[PDB]
């Protein structure tokens with residue numbers, strides 16, 4: 001209701017109401033439940049994916065501060081490592097979102113100069129931050145899925161097979177023809193105990 | 195008699211042992227308030243949960259029972275320590291201080307964790323300058339009454355707290371360590387003859403660092419039986435010279451004889467002891483944390499190493515990272531292959547496609563990254579692996595004839611393998627590792643939700659009567675009670691032991707764990723009759 | 726359907742029965758409301 | 764898939780006998796039952 005009142009102040013606020021297209025139609029709710037199921041894990045995963053980009057920020061600084069720099073004009077400034085957080089930023093922006101990590105937006109060791117340090121650096125970066133971490137993320141959700149399904153199946157079976165009121169199983173009730181279908185539809189029915 | 199039979203409900207216990215007449219019999223006894231009071235504190239409760247978890251999903255299924263008795267024996271020690279924490283004149287202050295640093299050890303840990311984030315937030319403001327306020331570093335903030343003075347001040351507090359956790363660990367979590375270590379030794383010598391008949395056997399390094407204490411005159415220090423050295427002389431004392439086992443167990447000549455500090459110190463025991471700890475994986479982590487806090491005074495960016503605890507033991511991070519540490523040798527192994535394949539490609543390219551390479555533009559174009567199988571190997575592990583279509587995106591373009599259909603095959607093969615197959619396998623392993631932990635956990639829980647620990651009977655038989663598997667698992671065969679018995683009988687002054695409490699005692703002192711039900715239970719035995 | 730689902734895969738196994746009685750007590754109220762609107 | 768197969772194998776064993784087919788239950792009624800009917804009586808190496 002409040003967003004529908006804001007829709008009269010600026011009509012683009014009516015775009016907020018399309019978020020119901022996620023709330024309770026069963027295919028969208030079961031899909032989004034795989035993401036919600038598993039929260040503190042994920043919100044923590046992302047947490048690590050920040051303390052693992054802060055450390056690649058620090059190191060660089062101390063040593064590789066020249067191998068950086070993103071300008072072209074002779075009077076080249078735009079030094080994204082000569083100030084406070086800019087690097088932490090440059091590492092959470094340009095970095096994380098790429099293919100080979102920082103190694104694709106920072107000069108090129110090539111010309112000697114600690115060559116075998118910026119190689120190690122980059123390869124260690126991309127490998128962790130892009131395989132390991134981003135991988136773990138897809139990992140959690142897939143599991144969360146399998147998880148819901150397992151619960152559901154357990155439910156159904158525990159039922160297809162045994163009684164609610166009492167606890168006897170199908171066997172001791174199926175020794176006779178159509179048995180577990182009587183001791184659960186006539187005798188110990190549920191609706192009737194109500 | 196309901197009032198009475200209720201006031202005394204928390205101070206009674208029902209066991210269900212089987213012995214003598216080959217029949218099930220019930221035992222009743224009394225438990226003090228303090229005996230039960232030191233059981234519901236959170237530290238012991240979490241120990242129960244962890245022990246139950248790692249005995250159903252590892253190699254038990256027969257010898258699980260002796261592990262349970264071993265579980266009781268160490269919680270016996272644990273509860274004694276907790277009771278003790280709740281010139282000349284300075285000794286009263288020092289015992290009160292050591293009891294203080296160990297009484298709240300987990301608050302010192304949270305306070306060190308908060309100071310790591312407080313220092314690292316202040317490090318985001320640094321800045322480099324071409325001249326002073328070449329290569330001059332400044333704290334680059336508005337003066338505030340903050341920044342530089344607070345960065346100086348917090349570096350002392352983090353080092354003080356990282357030092358106090360060494361003392362806090364050494365006076366709380368190391369006693370039990372040295373304990374679970376003497377028992378072992380004094381349990382091999384007698385009922386096996388370790389050094390009296392066989393021999394460590396090299397491989398067992400542990401079983402060697404510990405050939406130093408045997409002779410020590412305080413071997414059974416943190417261990418109840420200060421007589422072990424005399425039960426081995428009495429046993430393996432004939433088949434082996436009574437004057438030969440009268441050495442590798444100290445008691446030198448004792449066979450016949452059957453301020454402070456600096457003044458009395460078994461130099462040789464202390465040595466042994468020290469060794470035992472510089473190898474505990476929890477002590478080495480605590481030592482590293484302190485060392486990095488000292489390096490934090492040489493260059494303040496070393497305090498960024500302490501943010502790695504944000505992975506070590508908060509439960510969402512630990513369960514997430516545990517999916518990566520499971521399947522270790524697998525992963526590393528995979529990468530190994532991903533380095534042989536990109537080599538079986540280096541060898542190839544070279545021989546033929548060495549011109550299709552080259553990464554220069556100047557007329558005098560050199561930068562030929564294929565004039566050495568070394569550089570080629572790098573160019574293939576650098577530019578290559580990390581891309582979208584593999585080498586095919588950083589190496590000219592077949593197009594112009596020249597083996598066109600060879601560099602096509604090359605690239606497409608390289609690509610498909612190294613980027614689908616391999617990188618895929620990696621994500622594969624971790625996901626599985628996940629499913630793996632969950633399965634174990636579920637197994638644990640269920641095996642429990644459903645069956646008994648002491649014996650092995652299942653729910654069914656029990657659930658025949660209303661709420662069956664909640665009594666035979668909450669009264670009779672309870673677990674906590676098969677433990678309070680021990681502590682009880684240990685106090686009961688012998689001469690006043692009953693009949694059943696003397697069958698168990700003699701069976702405890704001789705390690706014959708056959709007094710546990712295992713397979714049966716009153717209800718079953720006395721079925722027909724009534725119970 | 727929803728009640729049956731969330732009593733087998735959570736912490737029942739003993740006290741499930743009082744939940745069932747609690748289930749009946751609220752559907753008792755529900756049916757009374759529907760009568761008052763028709 | 765491979766893991767499932769492996770687990771099945773192990774368990775089918777941790778739990779039941781090879782020569783005959785009786786399970787752990789009918790054997791564990793007594794103390795350490797199965798660990799006997801699979802290490803003394805119906806051992807396998809011995810039928811060899």
Ligand SMILES: Nc1ncnc2c1ncn2[C@@H]1O[C@H](COP(=O)(O)OP(=O)(O)OP(=O)(O)O)[C@@H](O)[C@H]1O
Pocket residue numbers: 159160161162163164165180183184185188189190191726
């Ligand atoms: N009291 C009971 N005791 C044992 N089993 C029961 C009991 N009530 C239901 N069941 C189990 O659930 C099944 C019957 O559920 P039913 O399909 O009637 O519920 P429903 O989905 O509301 O019905 P409908 O499909 O008509 O909507 C039976 O197979 C039975 O095994």
Ligand SMILES: Nc1ncnc2c1ncn2[C@@H]1O[C@H](COP(=O)(O)OP(=O)(O)OP(=O)(O)O)[C@@H](O)[C@H]1O
Pocket residue numbers: 239242243642643644645646647648663666667671672673674
């Ligand atoms: N001696 C036993 N024999 C059979 N089952 C047992 C035994 N001890 C515990 N259990 C099983 O474990 C459950 C009781 O565990 P309980 O929850 O009391 O441990 P806890 O988690 O330490 O307790 P709390 O939840 O109060 O911390 C019961 O459902 C029971 O089936």
Ligand SMILES: Nc1ncnc2c1ncn2[C@@H]1O[C@H](COP(=O)(O)OP(=O)(O)OP(=O)(O)O)[C@@H](O)[C@H]1O
Pocket residue numbers: 776777778779780781782800801802805806807808
């Ligand atoms: N004949 C049998 N009948 C039933 N179970 C058997 C039989 N043989 C082996 N087993 C099962 O396998 C297990 C014994 O296998 P064992 O570990 O001895 O094989 P192994 O791995 O060759 O031995 P080791 O571990 O010494 O190499 C027992 O737990 C038992 O249940």
Ligand SMILES: CNC(=O)c1cc(Cl)cc(C)c1NC(=O)c1cc(Br)nn1-c1ncccc1Cl
Pocket residue numbers: 300301303304305306307359479480483503504505506507508
């Ligand atoms: C497994 N690491 C350790 O042993 C450890 C060792 C030392 Cl010397 C210092 C700290 C802060 C350590 N880290 C923790 O001890 C810790 C990190 C997180 Br996140 N939570 N957490 C914790 N766990 C329980 C109670 C209080 C806390 Cl603070």
Ligand SMILES: Cn1c(=O)c2c(ncn2C)n(C)c1=O
Pocket residue numbers: 267270418680684702703
């Ligand atoms: C003397 N004694 C014992 O005999 C004992 C014990 N714990 C188990 N036993 C058997 N403790 C702590 C003990 O002091």
Ligand SMILES: [Ca+2]
Pocket residue numbers: 689690691
């Ligand atoms: Ca007496």
Ligand SMILES: [Zn+2]
Pocket residue numbers: 163164165166167168183184188
């Ligand atoms: Zn029924």
Ligand SMILES: [Zn+2]
Pocket residue numbers: 646647648649650651666667671715
């Ligand atoms: Zn039991």
Ligand SMILES: [Zn+2]
Pocket residue numbers: 780781782783784785800801805
């Ligand atoms: Zn058999």
